[PDB]
Amino acid sequence: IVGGRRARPHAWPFMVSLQLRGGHFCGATLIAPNFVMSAAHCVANVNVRAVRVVLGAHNLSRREPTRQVFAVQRIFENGYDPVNLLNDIVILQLNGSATINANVQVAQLPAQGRRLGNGVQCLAMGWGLLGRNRGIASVLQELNVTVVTSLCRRSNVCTLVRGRQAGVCFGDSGSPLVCNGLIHGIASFVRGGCASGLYPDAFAPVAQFVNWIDSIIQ
Amino acid sequence: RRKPGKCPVTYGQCLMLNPPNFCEMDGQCKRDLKCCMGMCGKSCVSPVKA
Ligand SMILES: *[C@@H]1O[C@H](CO[C@@H]2O[C@@H](C)[C@@H](O)[C@@H](O)[C@@H]2O)[C@@H](O)[C@H](O)[C@H]1NC(C)=O
Ligand SMILES: *[C@@H]1O[C@H](CO[C@@H]2O[C@@H](C)[C@@H](O)[C@@H](O)[C@@H]2O)[C@@H](O)[C@H](O)[C@H]1NC(C)=O
Structure with a gap:
């Protein structure tokens, strides 16, 4: 993270x-x-x-x-x-x-077929890279993210941090995305490197x- | 050694530190295939135009 x-x-x-x-x-x-x-x-x-x-x-x-x-x-x-x-x-x-x-x-899971709209606030987490490189995280990290639909496939749930460069990173694969107490995503892939500020991070859509x-x- | 042609473009990169690879260079692939990074690790794939 x-x-x-x-x-x-x-x-x-x-x-x-x-x-x-x-x-x-x-x-x-x-x-x-x-x-x-x-x-x-x-x-x-x-x-x-x-x-x-x-x-x-x-x-x-x-x-x-x-x-x-x-x-x-x-x-x-x-x-x-x-x-x-x-x-x-x-x-x-x-x-x-x-x-x-x-x-x-x-963990608690959402209902089948539940799709999250733009602007929903979620929490990503994981033991992946801190970036700099500050190397890998010893202590579990968490990050507030916003669901986005632009530059995301319908077959994914994607998130983007508003107004600064932050996001999931290598080693975060497989980690949950928690939205309103429910696991809506499993970290899958990034584009443009971690925390590009442009490409949303992509999660497998648990729902x-x-x-x-x-x-x-x- | 590296072979003629280009690796196919890919959409994004899986969030693993070290995605497992099945090849490290083109010579490890058969015929005209190249060792190319996919979305998650390297594999032998048919080349695209240069
Ligand atoms: C469940 O597995 C535990 C871990 O087993 C160890 O790790 C795996 C990946 C293998 O390398 C294995 O040979 C190692 O022993 C065990 O400690 C535990 O006893 C298992 N529980 C059972 C049998 O119910
Ligand atoms: C940052 O996020 C914090 C936790 O968010 C809430 O709990 C997580 C586990 C998810 O269920 C998520 O959807 C919830 O919103 C908030 O407590 C905190 O307010 C957020 N910070 C800011 C700046 O708004």
């Missing part, structure tokens, strides 16, 4: 870090005690058997007792197109069920997949 701020510890208890060899490579969202959702492109070309799903994290550079760690048991995808990053969403069933507590909680998500998790 470029141009955002530190989250308060465990402010977003559904926020997940996907890790390989003990290193964060993508965000994810806890959507049931035993399921997370992320961007399909995150796992498309990694060994799914090697992925560690880290719940209850805040500072990736510290040992944290609040963490719960799982492996991926099963994978579900619904028409992911890697050329165009369409349907860039994956559900990963965990090899166990999280203990629900202060620091690990399940378009809710019936499919429920068909798996319910």
Whole structure:
């Protein structure tokens, strides 16, 4: 996240870090005690058997007792197109069920087909680059963003920070976009580099997949 | 070595630090294919005009 701020510890208890060899490579969202959702492109070309799903994290550079760690048991995808990053969403069933507590909680999803209009205020977050480069974030970052429809595909939800250069950045793939307490986006791609001030950041539109998500998790 | 032709244009870039690549140079691709960055990592693709 470029141009955002530190989250308060465990402010977003559904926020997940996907890790390989003990290193964060993508965000994810806890959507049931035993399921997370992320961007399909995150796992498309990694060994799914090697992925560690880290719940209850805040500072990736510290040992944290609040963490719960799982492996991926099963994978579900619904028409992911890697050329165009369409349907860039994956559900990963965990090899166990999280203990629900202060620091690990399940996210709430919008209704099927809900589309957000221009100007809706959302919150993006993640452990991606801070930009400068200030390098990667140790502490989870968050950023106020505005939904935009211009320079966005109908198959995405896009956001743009008003009047300054800020936005999601590399390492934020798969992270949730929260709008009015609901997960409406999964970070997918940028254009013109991070925080271009021109191109909206693009998210997989979670609301378009809710019936499919429920068909798996319910 | 690099081959004739150009890589196709792409719409945007996935938000991974290091998108996995399946090639690093054109010579690793068959026939006239080039090693090109897609939206998320490099792959062997047919060339477009230069
Ligand atoms: C769930 O998986 C946990 C992590 O397993 C470890 O990481 C994975 C990616 C593999 O490398 C595996 O060989 C490692 O052991 C386990 O610690 C945990 O016991 C598993 N829970 C079960 C079996 O319900
Ligand atoms: C920045 O955003 C803060 C949090 O936004 C609200 O909560 C998040 C989790 C989403 O549900 C989002 O849609 C909500 O708007 C606000 O509390 C704060 O007012 C915002 N700051 C400014 C300058 O307006």
